[PDB]
């Protein structure tokens, strides 16, 4: 999937990612981070994957290893359709704004003040990114 | 500058790139391409660089070498301010839509039907990209 690299996504800014979920999707993820074998914020939108149905699984990855999962059952997404999510953060917490207006919080586990990449994975295509 | 990679920018689609020119700019470029040491379309917006003032210099790069320059004196850009450009193409030609409504044409010198990256260089920051 699309990777947007060398971004300067700093404390207090807003990153919006828009796209279209594939018609026949198991899951897709948004992945934000600041170093090559790590992902500070992984947001996995699981229509159906593993033991999860219509569940968001959130995690982080440190040197290619997944950390502790968190889940949300707020799942305002439909296969084949557009979505948009916006992410902001402070030193302690990522704030993920879902398009139904629900907010998920996830810990800023590496204590980052800036990020330099975002990429999509899975059963969706990125159509736009905005950073300001 | 920001690089957007693993895009699928196909014949007939539209790629829009928006950003803000630095307050004190010499030049910035938009660079679209499909292989690692090449740039199919380089659009250099020169406020002042070399012998050029307020000139767009267009070129392509093949295996790290620049090809023949083309110029436009249509220069609807201001240092410190937002800009947006949209690019489309067919097998023969790139069509670059400037925000004053002027269109620049530049040859599709490698005969590409799709591109997989766009990156910004120079004295500007990318704020958004849309691909559909
Ligand atoms: O933690 C994010 C990570 O999850 C992996 O899937 C896990 C799954 O969540 C868990 O229930 C099961 O026991 O193990 C799976 C494999 O580790 C995904 O494979 C990975 O891509 C991330 O999404
Ligand atoms: O052709 C695009 C390429 O131009 C380089 O600058 C040229 C300049 O246009 C030319 O007038 C002068 O004689 O040579 C310069 C150096 O090759 C830029 O340096 C390069 O970044 C591209 O923008």
Count of all domains of chain A = 1
Our Rg estimate of chain A from Cα atoms comes to 14 Å
Number of β-strand runs of chain A:
12
By helix and strand content of chain A, what is the structural category? mainly beta
Beta-sheet strand percentage of chain A? over 45%
Provide the CATH architecture of chain A: Sandwich
CATH class of chain A: Mainly Beta
Q: Give the oligomeric state of the chains in this entry, treating copies of one chain as homo and distinct chains as hetero.
A: homodimer
The N- and C-terminal alpha carbons of chain A lie at a distance of 22 Å
The dominant shape of chain A is globular
H-E order of chain A: EEEEEEEEEEEE
The two chains with the largest interface, and their residue counts, are: A-B, 16 and 16 residues
- Helical percent range of chain A? under 10%
Bound compounds, please? a molecule of 2 linked components (BGC-GAL)
Helical region count of chain A? 0
CATH topology of chain A: Jelly Rolls
What about the largest sheet of chain A? 7 strands, antiparallel
Structure description:
- 2 copies of one chain form a homodimer.
- With about 130 residues, chain A is an all-beta fold.
- Chain A has one domain (about 1-130): Jelly Rolls (Sandwich), CATH 2.60.120.200.
- The first copy, chain A, is about 0% helix and about 65% strand.
- Chain A has no helices and 12 strands.
- The first copy, chain A, has strands at about 5-10, 15-20, 25-35, 40-50, 50-60, 65, 70, 80-90, 95, 105, 115-120, 125-130.
- In chain A, strands 1, 3, 4, 5, 6, 7 and 11 form a 7-stranded antiparallel β-sheet that branches.
- The two termini of chain A are about 20 Å apart.
- The interface of A and B includes residues 3, 7, 128 and 132 of A.
- The structure holds a molecule of 2 linked components (BGC-GAL) (2 copies).
- A molecule of 2 linked components (BGC-GAL) binds near residues 50, 66 and 69 of chain A.
């Amino acid at each position: 999937g699309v990777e947007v690299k060398n971004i300067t996504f700093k404390l207090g800014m807003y990153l919006t990612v828009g796209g279209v979920v594939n018609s026949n999707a198991n899951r897709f993820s948004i992945n934000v981070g600041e170093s090559t074998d790590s992902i500070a914020l992984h947001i996995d939108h699981r229509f159906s994957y593993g033991a999860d149905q219509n569940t968001i699984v959130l995690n982080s990855m440190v040197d290619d290893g997944w950390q502790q999962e968190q889940r949300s059952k707020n799942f305002p997404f439909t296969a084949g359709e557009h979505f948009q999510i916006t992410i902001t953060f402070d030193i302690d917490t990522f704030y993920i704004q879902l398009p139904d207006g629900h907010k998920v919080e996830f810990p800023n586990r590496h204590g980052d003040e800036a990020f330099n990449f975002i990429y999509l994975a899975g059963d969706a295509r990125l159509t736009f990114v905005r950073l300001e």
